Amino acid sequence: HMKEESEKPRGFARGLEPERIIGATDSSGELMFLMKWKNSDEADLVPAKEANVKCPQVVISFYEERLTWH
Amino acid sequence: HMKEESEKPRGFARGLEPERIIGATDSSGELMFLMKWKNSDEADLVPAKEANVKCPQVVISFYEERLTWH
């Protein structure tokens, strides 16, 4: 956020439209998502905080598959 | 949606502000959430479709605890 670019774009910064999340992790506490990109094979990790707001519908859709209500 | 009220309000219709989801299930395919209500002990189930749009931030927050990335 402060200066993710500077030389190379990453995640949403890349500009690529998020098709559907296909990954999840965490840097050191905050959750993460390996967001997918339209017409782009190579994806990119995006902070859970950024995804769960810029793409609420998308992130929510992802959980559906990787749920665990049992 | 067609006429949930008619005589008695349920879920978001009640008007109560959703504090934090504390439940999840499914009628017959579509996921569900036992949405909580501000200054209200008695909660109420709300369709996943309604919650994952009217309260994206809330629903997303709920998954955080009930995750399963492993």
From Swiss-Prot, chains A, B:
List the residues marked with site Interacts with the PxVxL motif of TRIM28/TIF1B.
Answer: A24, T25, L34, L45, F62, R66, L67, W69
Ranges in coiled-coil conformation: none
Function of the molecule: Component of heterochromatin. Recognizes and binds histone H3 tails methylated at 'Lys-9', leading to epigenetic repression. Interaction with lamin B receptor (LBR) can contribute to the association of the heterochromatin with the inner nuclear membrane.
Q: In which tissues is it expressed?
A: In all adult and embryonic tissues.
Q: Where is the Chromo domain?
A: 16-70
Oligomeric form and interacting partners:
Homodimer. Interacts directly with CHAF1A, EMSY, LBR, TIF1/TIF1A and TRIM28/TIF1B PXVXL motif via the chromoshadow domain. Interacts directly with histone H3 methylated at 'Lys-9' via the chromo domain. Interacts with SUV39H1, SETDB1, KMT5B and KMT5C. Interacts with PRDM6. Interacts with POGZ. Interacts with CHAMP1. Interacts with INCENP. Interacts with SGO1; the CBX1 homodimer binds to one molecule of SGO1. Interacts with LRIF1 (via PxVxL motif). Interacts with HDGFL2. Interacts with CHD3. Interacts with CHD4.
Provide the cross-link position: Glycyl lysine isopeptide (Lys-Gly) (interchain with G-Cter in SUMO2): K49
Location comes to: Nucleus
Modification after translation (UniProt) = Not phosphorylated.
In Swiss-Prot or TrEMBL terms, this protein is called Chromobox protein homolog 1
Q: Where is the composition biased (Basic and acidic residues)?
A: 3-20
Query: Shown portion of the whole protein?
Result: 104 to 171 of 185
Q: Where are the transmembrane segments?
A: none
